[PDB]
Amino acid sequence: ETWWYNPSIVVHPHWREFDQVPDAVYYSLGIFIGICGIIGCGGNGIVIYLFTKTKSLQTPANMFIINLAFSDFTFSLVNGFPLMTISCFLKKWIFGFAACKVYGFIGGIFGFMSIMTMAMISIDRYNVIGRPMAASKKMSHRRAFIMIIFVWLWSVLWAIGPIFGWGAYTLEGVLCNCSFDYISRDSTTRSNILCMFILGFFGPILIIFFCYFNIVMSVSNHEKEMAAMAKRLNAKELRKAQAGANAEMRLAKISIVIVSQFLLSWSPYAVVALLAQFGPLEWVTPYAAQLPVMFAKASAIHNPMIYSVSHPKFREAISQTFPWVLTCCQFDDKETEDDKDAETEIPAGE
């Protein structure tokens, strides 16, 4: 009788008025997300493997990186193959409502986790680079551990609403993947959406900007300070300190690129969602929602590749364990120099 009917999940009327997209579109969608599964799990596994097992990458802050990779790993796993990919190739979600909920809930829980983890990373950056060199503070296992616990609690908190009725996780677009309900406009649903956007999204964003804008409005605070201590009879041993700042600065830069990646990846879909909940629902067509959600879903497969082209210690490790990966991005000793000096201690004024 219809092309959208699902015996397990009640498709919102809105998605029911559209014609069924062509086979080639379903197939491309499945192939697409399936490849995010491979790259995502592949790349994130490597970071988790390399970071937990390399000695040069054993600092507390790096735990955030690992946490982020676990987050992105699980997103790519659960959101790609086989729940969506298989659904596409059959032009239908055959895994039942429970799976849909788990799917949507997992997607949200780790989407909220990736930015909040980045937030914790932006904080570490502020303590090592944002504050003055005299008050510079490095991340400690204690702190770090407590921070991720906050991250996990936070992430689950703002994504579990629909699990208990305060919102919902159902099919969207071509009906082969799940997400929260941004169509229904009842008090309940709308409050959960507002909570997701404000608490889950805008929240960590503020922390981010407050930390990076704080690192920018301190580049000069540091610019002067560097000199004051420089001519402070500080010998050639001043170079050491300088290298350290460069090394840290580079990582801070990295942090920003992965954050930019996240935002550029999710903001579109976020917007289309808001239109569906506050604007012209007639705009939210099958592709209007689908295409932007795919872009969002792939977000979880970018950090590893970003790291592989700009992270020295990490690039080192790769060259030493899975060198084929760095083919087009060949590693060199000179990439780790700044880390060498930054750590090479001075023997009693040398």
Ligand X SMILES: CCCCCCCCCCCCCCCCCCCCCC
Ligand Y SMILES: *C/C=C(C)/C=C\C=C(C)\C=C\C1=C(C)CCCC1(C)C
Ligand Z SMILES: *C(=O)CCCCCCCCCCCCCCC
Ligand U SMILES: CCCCCCCCO[C@@H]1O[C@H](CO)[C@@H](O)[C@H](O)[C@H]1O
CB atoms within 10 A of CB 339: 18
39 binds ligand U (CB under 6 A): no
- Please give the backbone phi and psi of residue 136, each rounded to the nearest 5 degrees, phi first: -45, 135
Binder among 52, 234, 260, 320 for ligand Z (CB under 6 A): 52
SS3 179: strand
Question: Which residues inside 118-147 make contact with ligand U, applying CB under 6 A?
Answer: 121, 124, 138
71 binds ligand Y (CB under 6 A): no
102 binds ligand Z (CB under 6 A): no
Binder among 174, 196, 211, 276 for ligand Y (CB under 6 A): 196
Q: Tokens 């959208």: give the residue.
A: 4
Q: Which of 64, 57, 78 is nearest to 258 (CA)?
A: 64
329 binds ligand Z (CB under 6 A): yes
User: Looking at this protein, which amino acid is placed at residue 246?
Assistant: N
SS3 14: helix
CB atoms within 10 A of CB 96: 13
244 binds ligand X (CB under 6 A): no
| Rounded alpha-carbon distances, angstroms, from residue 11 to 70, 175, 298 | 32, 8, 25
Q: How far is the CB of 115 from ligand Y (least distance, A)?
A: 7
Q: How far is the CB of 61 from ligand U (least distance, A)?
A: 4
What per-residue string of b and e applies to 25-64 under the rule 16 or more CB within 10 Å gives b?
bbeebbebbbbbbebbbebbbbbbebbeebeebebbbbbb
Binder among 30, 37, 80, 108 for ligand Y (CB under 6 A): 108
- Contact range with ligand U by CB under 6 A, out of 8-16, 60-68, 85-93, 142-150: 60-68
Please tell me the distance from the alpha carbon of residue 210 to that of residue 223, in angstroms, as a whole number.
20
Q: How far is the CB of 293 from ligand Z (least distance, A)?
A: 17
Please tell me the distance from the alpha carbon of residue 39 to that of residue 302, in angstroms, as a whole number.
9
- Could you say which of ligand Y, ligand X, ligand U, none residue 163 binds, taking C-beta under 5 to 8 angstroms by partner kind? none
- Please give the backbone phi and psi of residue 171, each rounded to the nearest 5 degrees, phi first: -75, 155
Q: How far is the CB of 59 from ligand U (least distance, A)?
A: 4
Binder among 33, 36, 48, 273 for ligand Z (CB under 6 A): 48
Q: What angle do CA 174, 288, 89 make, to 5 degrees?
A: 25
Asked if 60 and 148 count as a contact pair (C-beta separation under 8 A), the reply is: no
Minimum CB distance to ligand U smaller for 17 or for 333: 333
- Contact range with ligand X by CB under 6 A, out of 21-29, 105-113, 203-211, 300-308: 300-308
- Binding-site string for ligand Y from residue 261 to residue 280, where x marks contact by CB under 6 A and - marks none: -----x---x--x-------
List 170's β-bridge partners, or say none: 179
- Contact range with ligand X by CB under 6 A, out of 39-47, 148-156, 242-250, 267-275: 39-47
Please tell me the distance from the alpha carbon of residue 194 to that of residue 201, in angstroms, as a whole number.
10
Q: How far is the CB of 46 from ligand Z (least distance, A)?
A: 10
Asked if 34 and 85 count as a contact pair (C-beta separation under 8 A), the reply is: yes
Asked if 304 and 329 count as a contact pair (C-beta separation under 8 A), the reply is: no
Q: How many chain residues touch ligand Z (CB under 6 A)?
A: 13
309 binds ligand Z (CB under 6 A): yes
Binder among 63, 65, 183, 301 for ligand U (CB under 6 A): 65
Minimum CB distance to ligand Y smaller for 103 or for 331: 103
- Could you say which of ligand Y, ligand Z, ligand U, none residue 155 binds, taking C-beta under 5 to 8 angstroms by partner kind? none
242 binds ligand U (CB under 6 A): no
Binding-site ranges for ligand Z (CB under 6 A): 45, 48, 52, 73-74, 77, 305, 308-309, 325-326, 328-329
Binding-site ranges for ligand X (CB under 6 A): 38-39, 42-43, 46, 304-305, 308, 325
